[PDB]
Amino acid sequence: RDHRKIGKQLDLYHMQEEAPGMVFWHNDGWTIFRELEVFVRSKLKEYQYQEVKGPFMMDRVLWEKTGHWDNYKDAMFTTSSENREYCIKPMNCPGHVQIFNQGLKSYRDLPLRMAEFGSCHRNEPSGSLHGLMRVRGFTQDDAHIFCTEEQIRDEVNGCIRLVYDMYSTFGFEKIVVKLSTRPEKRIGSDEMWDRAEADLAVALEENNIPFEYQLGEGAFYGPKIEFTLYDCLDRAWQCGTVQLDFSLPSRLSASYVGEDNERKVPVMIHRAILGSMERFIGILTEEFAGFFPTWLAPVQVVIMNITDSQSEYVNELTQKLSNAGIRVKADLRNEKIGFKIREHTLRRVPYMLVCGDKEVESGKVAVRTRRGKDLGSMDVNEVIEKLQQEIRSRSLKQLEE
Amino acid sequence: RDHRKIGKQLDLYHMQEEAPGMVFWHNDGWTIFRELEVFVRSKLKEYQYQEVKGPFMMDRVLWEKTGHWDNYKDAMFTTSSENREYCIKPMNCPGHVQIFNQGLKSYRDLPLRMAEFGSCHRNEPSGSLHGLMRVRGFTQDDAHIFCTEEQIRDEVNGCIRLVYDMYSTFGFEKIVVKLSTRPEKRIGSDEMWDRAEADLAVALEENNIPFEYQLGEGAFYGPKIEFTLYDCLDRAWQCGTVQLDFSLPSRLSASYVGEDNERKVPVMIHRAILGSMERFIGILTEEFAGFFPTWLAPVQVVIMNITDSQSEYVNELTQKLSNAGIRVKADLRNEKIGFKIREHTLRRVPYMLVCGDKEVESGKVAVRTRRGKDLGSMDVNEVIEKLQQEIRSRSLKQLEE
Ligand SMILES: C[C@@H](O)[C@H](N)C(=O)NS(=O)(=O)OC[C@H]1O[C@@H](n2cnc3c(N)ncnc32)[C@H](O)[C@@H]1O
Ligand SMILES: C[C@@H](O)[C@H](N)C(=O)NS(=O)(=O)OC[C@H]1O[C@@H](n2cnc3c(N)ncnc32)[C@H](O)[C@@H]1O
Ligand SMILES: [Zn+2]
Ligand SMILES: [Zn+2]
């Protein structure tokens, strides 16, 4: 169930030697990506996350202040303009702090949850690249929560709930979790690390989450919980993650007015639920073997004619399903119906509607599924409602299965 | 009237020295950006376009092949990795051709309209930067149409119609059209330029569009129709653009199987309707002086109490409007109602619902607008239906105005 082969077969994306680890999302792959963004946005609205967009690059001075220049230099791409040096962002956190720093903040504004579908670039060693799982340019479903020390428990709990809730939609209910502790190269005192590692360990146990400690694998700025999903070859991939940061806000001069009217430095929780769109889509492609649930399917329905005689009927139904919000395409090619059906079956199109003369003068449609099931003759409005229901509920199963 | 001042007043975005010409989109500005994307996508669907996403950078060798290295060198940011040089993309076209090049193409696949909200970076001289109008990082509502020479007329006409179609939503009264011809530094033969310039002029005449020439300002790869919009100081800004390219496809080895079964090179039409999201938002901000039509307004409705006595009611109404899909916020502060109305008017919030004891008992709301108008008491569901209609129709006007 190699996602790279499936990606080619379903025309989802491609990569080239001229852009190692740089993904070209084709129309169908991009549709999946966009549906995942819609899903993430829907889930975050529930938590009142703001959504922002930060700059693609920032001055070297900024990255020196955060600690990235000294602890993350090899992974960063650099460029220049007018003798000024810039780093293309490998993370979205610094930009989020810059936004937080605009306008006086008070304890009343916390917790402040700031999300971004942030494009990150990291100069990963070429030999470590692997399909969509490890690339050089990727988009994270990122967010940073600015809060008080007393709010850490609840905010970390909120991130954890988000992970399990969102993962359950895809059928993932068996997650291997790691707590990666202080790395050799790091910022912050040992006292700070003791406190942060403890906070995360307690959060995991309070949630009855079995986890394994992982020596020296934390971020340079804080310990991290890793939510692990496996690929077809049983290789572990870090997808969701939660990190506790007591260093970056101070380094970037972030503060707020406490209730005691004194200036305080907020705590920052970093988290990505899916991880990156690229990696998560890679995992989903292998998990479903290309049979994406209807809500995620690039093309949900294909309508085919037998001969040019049903073309008009097919075009009418196509526009009708399209107006109903279904991703539909008409296949009016001069090919045998069995040839068309095989093609769309291989493309994993959830539903196929066949229209012969009988369907045209009946006003109905013959329905088939990509699993080869013959659903017989159905009413057009009936198929539309059933599809809309399957889509709205983001169901893992198709009609009658 | 200046978008930079209005942007600050509405907390839409900010810029700073560590990222010259790079926008930090705050929640409210990003909301506008996202609504424009939804709008464009609605039109892309209607006009039959695929939507893709290309990589942020590619090998400098590819940019040499396209002619960008010799004709667009100063504008490109460069970076490197493992002994190889890369250019951060200043345009989305080469990436689209790489996608087109994947999989054998037939004349039956044309015209192939490929759109992308493409993030471009150009090393614009710092002295030339201006708010959101001229930045170094921006997102184009770009697309490239691959077609046959016989399809040029219909495809260019389609782009022109799309421009006026989309622009009518905003009610622009001043749109100056320019036909920018062959520049000093260019690729392609003089005969090719003669044909391309003539094709664009004929398209403009066929659509009854008066225009003026702009000698020597075409792209290095082809002539351009420019749809010019103006800011509050009546300064001209190129927004929409349609360009005809007979050079890039060949340079990047693009081809398709013709009807005669012979290999043919497709013509490529480049076009952006809004231009860049950044520049377009700058223009809209000045055009409306911050009074964004309700569908674009960051916050569409603010519900306010008088005393904490109506807080529960206000919270219930805010949840109800939120569930109805309206961008609503509650203002429960212990501030004079006159001050609250003043503040949200400064923020250009379309509608303000005032809730005193009478409203709580009646189950209604007192409606006011940012234009200072009193719409009186209204039923909550009535307000919801009217706002949803104003939003769905992307109407330029508010209730009773
Ligand atoms: C969570 C963020 O706020 C934090 N700054 C951060 O970047 N954490 S991270 O470095 O662990 O990255 C977050 C997620 O991005 C994904 N990711 C990281 N590197 C890559 C890569 N090279 N290719 C694909 N996905 C990646 C992983 O799923 C990872 O869990
Ligand atoms: C239309 C594209 O396919 C074509 N390759 C292209 O890039 N044309 S362009 O160079 O004229 O740019 C398209 C639009 O982007 C916008 N744009 C260009 N440069 C900037 C900039 N520095 N800041 C903001 N918007 C810009 C303008 O509205 C312009 O009309
Ligand atoms: Zn982070
Ligand atoms: Zn182009």
PDB file of C-alpha atoms in Angstrom, chain A residues 8 11 14-20 22-28 30-31 34 37 41 45 49-59 62 65 77-82 84 86 88 94-96 98-99 102 119 121 123-127 136 322-323 325-326, chain B residues 11 14-20 22-28 30-31 34 37 41 45 49-60 62 65 77-82 84 86 88 94-96 98-99 102 117 121 123-127 136 322-323 325-326:
ATOM      1  CA  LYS A   8       0.925   8.245  -9.230  1.00  0.00           C
ATOM      2  CA  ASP A  11      -2.679  11.485 -10.148  1.00  0.00           C
ATOM      3  CA  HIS A  14       4.466  14.238  -8.209  1.00  0.00           C
ATOM      4  CA  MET A  15       8.031  15.174  -7.359  1.00  0.00           C
ATOM      5  CA  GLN A  16      11.038  15.859  -9.597  1.00  0.00           C
ATOM      6  CA  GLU A  17      14.814  16.050  -9.452  1.00  0.00           C
ATOM      7  CA  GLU A  18      14.560  19.837  -9.959  1.00  0.00           C
ATOM      8  CA  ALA A  19      12.823  20.157  -6.590  1.00  0.00           C
ATOM      9  CA  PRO A  20      13.979  17.363  -4.237  1.00  0.00           C
ATOM     10  CA  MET A  22       9.281  19.673  -3.051  1.00  0.00           C
ATOM     11  CA  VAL A  23       5.712  18.552  -3.740  1.00  0.00           C
ATOM     12  CA  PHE A  24       3.693  19.358  -6.868  1.00  0.00           C
ATOM     13  CA  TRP A  25       0.077  18.898  -5.786  1.00  0.00           C
ATOM     14  CA  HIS A  26      -2.060  17.972  -8.796  1.00  0.00           C
ATOM     15  CA  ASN A  27      -5.741  18.863  -8.866  1.00  0.00           C
ATOM     16  CA  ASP A  28      -6.896  15.667  -7.212  1.00  0.00           C
ATOM     17  CA  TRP A  30      -4.882  19.334  -3.803  1.00  0.00           C
ATOM     18  CA  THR A  31      -8.603  18.580  -3.384  1.00  0.00           C
ATOM     19  CA  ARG A  34      -8.182  21.437   0.867  1.00  0.00           C
ATOM     20  CA  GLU A  37      -8.104  22.213   5.816  1.00  0.00           C
ATOM     21  CA  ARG A  41     -11.019  24.716  10.500  1.00  0.00           C
ATOM     22  CA  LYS A  45     -13.897  26.907  15.482  1.00  0.00           C
ATOM     23  CA  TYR A  49      -8.774  29.587  17.586  1.00  0.00           C
ATOM     24  CA  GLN A  50      -7.775  32.675  15.628  1.00  0.00           C
ATOM     25  CA  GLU A  51      -6.238  31.920  12.224  1.00  0.00           C
ATOM     26  CA  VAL A  52      -3.375  34.002  10.881  1.00  0.00           C
ATOM     27  CA  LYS A  53      -0.675  33.935   8.225  1.00  0.00           C
ATOM     28  CA  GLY A  54       2.920  34.881   8.861  1.00  0.00           C
ATOM     29  CA  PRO A  55       5.761  35.927   6.502  1.00  0.00           C
ATOM     30  CA  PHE A  56       7.708  33.347   4.501  1.00  0.00           C
ATOM     31  CA  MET A  57      11.060  34.658   5.739  1.00  0.00           C
ATOM     32  CA  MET A  58      12.412  36.938   8.451  1.00  0.00           C
ATOM     33  CA  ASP A  59      15.760  38.558   9.243  1.00  0.00           C
ATOM     34  CA  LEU A  62      15.134  37.324  14.688  1.00  0.00           C
ATOM     35  CA  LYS A  65      17.069  35.673  19.228  1.00  0.00           C
ATOM     36  CA  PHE A  77      17.415  27.752   4.046  1.00  0.00           C
ATOM     37  CA  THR A  78      18.891  31.241   3.853  1.00  0.00           C
ATOM     38  CA  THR A  79      18.668  33.995   1.265  1.00  0.00           C
ATOM     39  CA  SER A  80      19.568  37.670   1.076  1.00  0.00           C
ATOM     40  CA  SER A  81      18.485  41.061  -0.188  1.00  0.00           C
ATOM     41  CA  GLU A  82      20.299  44.382  -0.040  1.00  0.00           C
ATOM     42  CA  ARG A  84      20.525  41.671   4.713  1.00  0.00           C
ATOM     43  CA  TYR A  86      17.040  36.078   5.908  1.00  0.00           C
ATOM     44  CA  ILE A  88      13.037  30.999   5.107  1.00  0.00           C
ATOM     45  CA  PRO A  94       8.285  33.270  15.827  1.00  0.00           C
ATOM     46  CA  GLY A  95       5.828  34.867  13.412  1.00  0.00           C
ATOM     47  CA  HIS A  96       2.981  34.111  15.799  1.00  0.00           C
ATOM     48  CA  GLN A  98       5.356  38.862  16.426  1.00  0.00           C
ATOM     49  CA  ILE A  99       1.592  39.012  15.912  1.00  0.00           C
ATOM     50  CA  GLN A 102       1.047  43.805  18.394  1.00  0.00           C
ATOM     51  CA  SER A 119       4.253  26.551   5.117  1.00  0.00           C
ATOM     52  CA  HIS A 121      10.815  24.644   4.721  1.00  0.00           C
ATOM     53  CA  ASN A 123      16.772  21.514   4.392  1.00  0.00           C
ATOM     54  CA  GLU A 124      16.381  17.831   5.222  1.00  0.00           C
ATOM     55  CA  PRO A 125      19.302  15.625   4.118  1.00  0.00           C
ATOM     56  CA  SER A 126      18.417  14.274   0.659  1.00  0.00           C
ATOM     57  CA  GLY A 127      19.005  10.691   1.745  1.00  0.00           C
ATOM     58  CA  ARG A 136      11.554  19.776   2.463  1.00  0.00           C
ATOM     59  CA  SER A 322     -22.470  19.734  -8.997  1.00  0.00           C
ATOM     60  CA  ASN A 323     -24.970  22.350  -7.848  1.00  0.00           C
ATOM     61  CA  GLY A 325     -22.087  20.378  -3.838  1.00  0.00           C
ATOM     62  CA  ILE A 326     -20.913  16.956  -4.971  1.00  0.00           C
TER      63      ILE A 326
ATOM     64  CA  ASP B  11      -6.225  45.310  13.215  1.00  0.00           C
ATOM     65  CA  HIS B  14       1.106  44.677  10.254  1.00  0.00           C
ATOM     66  CA  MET B  15       4.606  44.821   8.847  1.00  0.00           C
ATOM     67  CA  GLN B  16       7.995  45.221  10.486  1.00  0.00           C
ATOM     68  CA  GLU B  17      11.696  45.772   9.752  1.00  0.00           C
ATOM     69  CA  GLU B  18      12.653  42.114  10.235  1.00  0.00           C
ATOM     70  CA  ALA B  19      10.619  41.227   7.129  1.00  0.00           C
ATOM     71  CA  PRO B  20      10.568  44.094   4.577  1.00  0.00           C
ATOM     72  CA  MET B  22       6.340  40.607   4.075  1.00  0.00           C
ATOM     73  CA  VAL B  23       2.811  40.816   5.523  1.00  0.00           C
ATOM     74  CA  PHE B  24       1.829  39.495   8.948  1.00  0.00           C
ATOM     75  CA  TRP B  25      -1.895  38.819   8.399  1.00  0.00           C
ATOM     76  CA  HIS B  26      -3.800  39.149  11.659  1.00  0.00           C
ATOM     77  CA  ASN B  27      -6.980  37.154  12.245  1.00  0.00           C
ATOM     78  CA  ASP B  28      -9.225  39.855  10.853  1.00  0.00           C
ATOM     79  CA  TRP B  30      -6.773  36.856   7.081  1.00  0.00           C
ATOM     80  CA  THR B  31     -10.562  36.531   7.245  1.00  0.00           C
ATOM     81  CA  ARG B  34      -9.912  33.787   2.944  1.00  0.00           C
ATOM     82  CA  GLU B  37     -10.343  32.931  -1.938  1.00  0.00           C
ATOM     83  CA  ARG B  41     -12.982  29.481  -6.138  1.00  0.00           C
ATOM     84  CA  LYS B  45     -15.676  26.231 -10.584  1.00  0.00           C
ATOM     85  CA  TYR B  49     -10.551  25.407 -13.759  1.00  0.00           C
ATOM     86  CA  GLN B  50      -8.454  22.812 -11.969  1.00  0.00           C
ATOM     87  CA  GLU B  51      -6.681  24.054  -8.831  1.00  0.00           C
ATOM     88  CA  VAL B  52      -3.146  22.926  -7.960  1.00  0.00           C
ATOM     89  CA  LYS B  53      -0.233  23.888  -5.695  1.00  0.00           C
ATOM     90  CA  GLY B  54       3.351  24.069  -6.956  1.00  0.00           C
ATOM     91  CA  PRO B  55       6.574  24.034  -4.912  1.00  0.00           C
ATOM     92  CA  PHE B  56       8.055  27.191  -3.402  1.00  0.00           C
ATOM     93  CA  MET B  57      11.394  26.651  -5.076  1.00  0.00           C
ATOM     94  CA  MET B  58      12.969  24.767  -7.937  1.00  0.00           C
ATOM     95  CA  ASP B  59      16.459  24.233  -9.345  1.00  0.00           C
ATOM     96  CA  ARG B  60      17.988  27.369 -10.826  1.00  0.00           C
ATOM     97  CA  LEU B  62      14.859  25.326 -14.688  1.00  0.00           C
ATOM     98  CA  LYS B  65      15.580  27.365 -19.311  1.00  0.00           C
ATOM     99  CA  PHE B  77      15.628  35.235  -4.308  1.00  0.00           C
ATOM    100  CA  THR B  78      18.106  32.364  -4.371  1.00  0.00           C
ATOM    101  CA  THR B  79      19.113  29.720  -1.865  1.00  0.00           C
ATOM    102  CA  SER B  80      21.074  26.495  -1.950  1.00  0.00           C
ATOM    103  CA  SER B  81      21.265  22.966  -0.635  1.00  0.00           C
ATOM    104  CA  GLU B  82      23.791  20.182  -1.103  1.00  0.00           C
ATOM    105  CA  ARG B  84      22.724  22.949  -5.806  1.00  0.00           C
ATOM    106  CA  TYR B  86      17.473  27.079  -6.161  1.00  0.00           C
ATOM    107  CA  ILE B  88      12.281  30.838  -4.693  1.00  0.00           C
ATOM    108  CA  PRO B  94       6.966  26.995 -14.682  1.00  0.00           C
ATOM    109  CA  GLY B  95       5.475  24.864 -11.905  1.00  0.00           C
ATOM    110  CA  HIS B  96       2.215  24.577 -13.810  1.00  0.00           C
ATOM    111  CA  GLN B  98       5.847  20.792 -14.846  1.00  0.00           C
ATOM    112  CA  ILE B  99       2.433  19.533 -13.764  1.00  0.00           C
ATOM    113  CA  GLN B 102       3.117  14.716 -16.186  1.00  0.00           C
ATOM    114  CA  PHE B 117      -3.406  30.782  -5.297  1.00  0.00           C
ATOM    115  CA  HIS B 121       8.402  36.239  -3.829  1.00  0.00           C
ATOM    116  CA  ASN B 123      13.144  40.986  -4.439  1.00  0.00           C
ATOM    117  CA  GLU B 124      11.526  44.376  -4.996  1.00  0.00           C
ATOM    118  CA  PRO B 125      13.815  47.324  -4.152  1.00  0.00           C
ATOM    119  CA  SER B 126      13.059  48.358  -0.569  1.00  0.00           C
ATOM    120  CA  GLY B 127      12.506  51.967  -1.597  1.00  0.00           C
ATOM    121  CA  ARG B 136       7.977  41.164  -1.640  1.00  0.00           C
ATOM    122  CA  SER B 322     -22.368  31.811  15.228  1.00  0.00           C
ATOM    123  CA  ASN B 323     -24.149  28.518  14.565  1.00  0.00           C
ATOM    124  CA  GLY B 325     -22.583  30.932  10.154  1.00  0.00           C
ATOM    125  CA  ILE B 326     -22.369  34.652  10.900  1.00  0.00           C
TER     126      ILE B 326
END
